[PDB]
Design an enzyme around this catalytic site. Structure first.
Site, mmCIF file in Angstrom:
data_model
loop_
_atom_site.group_PDB
_atom_site.id
_atom_site.type_symbol
_atom_site.label_atom_id
_atom_site.label_comp_id
_atom_site.label_asym_id
_atom_site.label_seq_id
_atom_site.Cartn_x
_atom_site.Cartn_y
_atom_site.Cartn_z
ATOM 1 N N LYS A 287 7.659 -1.064 -3.565
ATOM 2 C CA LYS A 287 6.262 -1.402 -3.765
ATOM 3 C C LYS A 287 6.046 -2.880 -3.337
ATOM 4 O O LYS A 287 6.711 -3.782 -3.856
ATOM 5 C CB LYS A 287 5.838 -1.159 -5.212
ATOM 6 C CG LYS A 287 4.343 -1.205 -5.419
ATOM 7 C CD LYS A 287 4.045 -1.375 -6.896
ATOM 8 C CE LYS A 287 2.576 -1.418 -7.156
ATOM 9 N NZ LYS A 287 2.298 -1.226 -8.588
ATOM 10 N N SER B 179 -4.264 -4.901 -1.093
ATOM 11 C CA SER B 179 -3.419 -5.657 -2.025
ATOM 12 C C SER B 179 -1.987 -5.102 -2.129
ATOM 13 O O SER B 179 -1.034 -5.874 -2.012
ATOM 14 C CB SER B 179 -4.054 -5.722 -3.414
ATOM 15 O OG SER B 179 -3.954 -4.479 -4.096
ATOM 16 N N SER B 180 -1.840 -3.773 -2.374
ATOM 17 C CA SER B 180 -0.532 -3.139 -2.533
ATOM 18 C C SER B 180 -0.260 -1.944 -1.630
ATOM 19 O O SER B 180 -1.077 -1.022 -1.551
ATOM 20 C CB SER B 180 -0.271 -2.773 -3.987
ATOM 21 O OG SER B 180 -1.423 -2.167 -4.544
ATOM 22 N N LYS B 181 0.919 -1.971 -0.973
ATOM 23 C CA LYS B 181 1.455 -0.940 -0.092
ATOM 24 C C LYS B 181 2.793 -0.437 -0.678
ATOM 25 O O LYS B 181 3.592 -1.249 -1.133
ATOM 26 C CB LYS B 181 1.664 -1.520 1.322
ATOM 27 N N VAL B 182 3.018 0.886 -0.709
ATOM 28 C CA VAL B 182 4.279 1.481 -1.190
ATOM 29 C C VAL B 182 4.946 2.129 0.041
ATOM 30 O O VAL B 182 4.261 2.772 0.840
ATOM 31 C CB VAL B 182 4.107 2.485 -2.378
ATOM 32 C CG1 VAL B 182 5.459 2.968 -2.916
ATOM 33 C CG2 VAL B 182 3.280 1.877 -3.509
ATOM 34 N N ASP C 113 -5.581 5.546 -19.152
ATOM 35 C CA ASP C 113 -6.073 6.100 -17.896
ATOM 36 C C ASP C 113 -5.075 7.097 -17.294
ATOM 37 O O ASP C 113 -4.660 6.953 -16.141
ATOM 38 C CB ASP C 113 -6.505 5.001 -16.913
ATOM 39 C CG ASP C 113 -7.178 5.513 -15.647
ATOM 40 O OD1 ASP C 113 -8.179 6.266 -15.762
ATOM 41 O OD2 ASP C 113 -6.686 5.193 -14.550
ATOM 42 N N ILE D 116 4.054 5.195 1.873
ATOM 43 C CA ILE D 116 3.596 6.212 0.925
ATOM 44 C C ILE D 116 2.125 5.886 0.496
ATOM 45 O O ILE D 116 1.197 6.578 0.931
ATOM 46 C CB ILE D 116 4.597 6.438 -0.243
ATOM 47 C CG1 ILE D 116 5.981 6.910 0.291
ATOM 48 C CG2 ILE D 116 4.012 7.410 -1.263
ATOM 49 C CD1 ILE D 116 7.192 6.637 -0.676
ATOM 50 N N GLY D 117 1.936 4.797 -0.257
ATOM 51 C CA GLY D 117 0.629 4.344 -0.718
ATOM 52 C C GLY D 117 0.123 3.137 0.040
ATOM 53 O O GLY D 117 -0.853 2.514 -0.372
HETATM 54 C C1 LIG Z 1 5.846 3.937 -6.715
HETATM 55 C C2 LIG Z 1 6.986 4.622 -6.420
HETATM 56 C C3 LIG Z 1 6.886 5.882 -5.792
HETATM 57 C C4 LIG Z 1 8.020 6.663 -5.447
HETATM 58 N N1 LIG Z 1 7.969 7.843 -4.865
HETATM 59 C C5 LIG Z 1 6.750 8.326 -4.590
HETATM 60 S S1 LIG Z 1 6.445 9.885 -3.881
HETATM 61 C C6 LIG Z 1 4.732 9.705 -3.958
HETATM 62 C C7 LIG Z 1 4.335 8.529 -4.487
HETATM 63 C C8 LIG Z 1 5.480 7.695 -4.865
HETATM 64 C C9 LIG Z 1 5.587 6.403 -5.494
HETATM 65 C C10 LIG Z 1 4.503 5.572 -5.863
HETATM 66 N N2 LIG Z 1 4.612 4.381 -6.446
#
Ligand SMILES: c1cc2cnc3sccc3c2cn1
Length: 251
Positions: A35, A18-21, A129, A16-17
């Site tokens: 995360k 140092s840090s990868k989600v 923020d 989805i998204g």
């Molecule tokens: C932590 C948990 C998440 C869970 N679902 C989604 S859907 C689009 C971004 C995210 C997300 C981003 N950071």
């Protein structure tokens, strides 16, 4: 592709998204968000900011459903793994993709943002923020992704309060929420017209710079915006006051 958080195996579906989600599936074939955070080149002030945000997220979970679910976590000296709920899309990309936004979904989303921000405020947290990118759409319900405690839409001054530019109380979060509602109302943020970053900051602070509030069919919605977007924090509406406003309450 796989990964192990606290003895449980998770299969990666997509990033989805140092840090990868990532979007993942557990052994029981349930969908989650993981995360991953790399602590390898992180300092103590950074680690404390990270442990502080996790502890707040873990506690505030019990207080509201408008705060993202944190199911489990694994913390070492090298990394962090956080098992969270998976959202559909963040508020920013949902808005960017949508041309016109429904008045019922906008009223609904507003209510959710107030519920979430109000919770953090009851625990001594001022986010400072706030942006649409901080909210998640999960089953037609907005959820606050984070608390602004942990280090690092990013940089953006469009949702920044006048008091933040000059240098911070719950009123700051009120200004930012008002900018988000303004975007869902007018299609732009109050200062979006200004390209030049300095000229933008010079307008947010200046009281002689009148913010335009064009006549909309929702008179209550126009009042909320006018109430949130008041340069003096002392003259700005509070979250408990917003939760009692006719816009949120009248059918
Ligand atoms: C932590 C948990 C998440 C869970 N679902 C989604 S859907 C689009 C971004 C995210 C997300 C981003 N950071």
């Amino acid at each position: 592709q796989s990964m192990s958080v606290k003895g449980r195996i998770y299969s990666i579906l997509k990033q989805i998204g140092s840090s990868k989600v990532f979007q993942v599936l557990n052994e029981k074939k349930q969908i989650y968000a993981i995360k991953y955070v790399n602590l390898e080149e992180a300092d103590n002030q950074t680690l404390d900011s990270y442990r502080n945000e996790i502890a707040y997220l873990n506690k505030l979970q019990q207080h509201s459903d408008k705060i993202i679910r944190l199911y489990d976590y694994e913390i070492t000296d090298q990394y962090i793994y956080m098992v969270m709920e998976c959202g559909n899309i963040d508020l920013n990309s949902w808005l960017k993709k949508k041309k016109s936004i429904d008045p019922w979904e906008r009223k609904s989303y507003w209510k959710n943002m107030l519920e979430a921000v109000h919770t953090i405020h009851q625990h001594g947290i001022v986010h400072s923020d706030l942006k649409p990118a901080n909210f998640l759409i999960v089953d037609g319900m907005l959820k606050l992704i984070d608390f602004g405690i942990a280090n690092q839409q990013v940089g953006t001054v469009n949702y920044m309060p006048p008091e933040a530019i000059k240098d911070i109380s719950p009123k700051s979060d009120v200004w930012s929420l008002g900018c988000i509602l303004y975007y869902m109302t007018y299609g732009k943020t109050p200062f979006q017209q200004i390209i030049n970053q300095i000229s933008k900051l010079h307008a947010i602070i200046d009281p002689n710079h009148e913010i335009e509030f064009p006549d909309i069919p929702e008179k209550d919605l126009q009042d909320v915006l006018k109430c949130c977007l008041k340069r003096d924090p002392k003259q700005r509406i509070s979250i408990p006051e917003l939760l009692a406003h006719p816009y949120v309450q009248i059918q």
